């Protein structure tokens, strides 16, 4: 606020979808060319994800869609309550 895209790192319990949103919003706010923003995405998006999501994304291999990446990482982090609350 302003935040550098270099500093966006996924929290240990932050859902990967929340991290993708924060990464996108921070990169959108950066005053930079599209070429520089694309290099930042290629260099930082997976690299700054948390260890559990990096493990999953490494196993997916290159060329996944963002939908495939978010579906693969959906179970990491987020709410800690897993049992029948209801």
């Amino acid at each position, epitope marked *: 606020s*302003p935040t*550098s*895209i*270099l*500093d966006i*790192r996924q929290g240990p319990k932050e859902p990967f979808r929340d991290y993708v949103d924060r990464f996108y919003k921070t990169l959108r706010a*950066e*005053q*930079a*060319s599209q*070429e*520089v923003k694309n*290099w*930042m995405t290629e*260099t*930082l998006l997976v*690299q*700054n994800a948390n260890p559990d999501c990096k493990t999953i994304l490494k196993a997916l291999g290159p060329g996944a869609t963002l939908e495939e990446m978010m579906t693969a990482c959906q179970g990491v982090g987020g709410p800690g309550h897993k049992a029948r609350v209801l």
Partner: nanobody
Amino acid sequence: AQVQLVESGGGLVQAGGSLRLSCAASGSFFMSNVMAWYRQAPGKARELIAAIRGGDMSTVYDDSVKGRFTITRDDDKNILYLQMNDLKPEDTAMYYCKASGSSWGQGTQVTVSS
């Protein structure tokens, strides 16, 4: 944000001149994989003009500095550099470096006359 940065190398030059900016990282024997240079002129947002990643040494530049500026990193000294050639009055700004998770430095002023 633990690693501390500090820029040097700015000054007043005539159009067509050259400067070499240095950014010294302290607080670690190492620097983050990605580092960048930002340009900030009065009344404007900071602009991400050059970046580098360790390992493959890939770099990227804003179109306004292509063919004139070069970003390099020396991990044996913990210094990031910006070689600025063929300076233009529109390059006048405060220049700041950044590393992932680092604190911000005080920047260095570059003033280009004509």
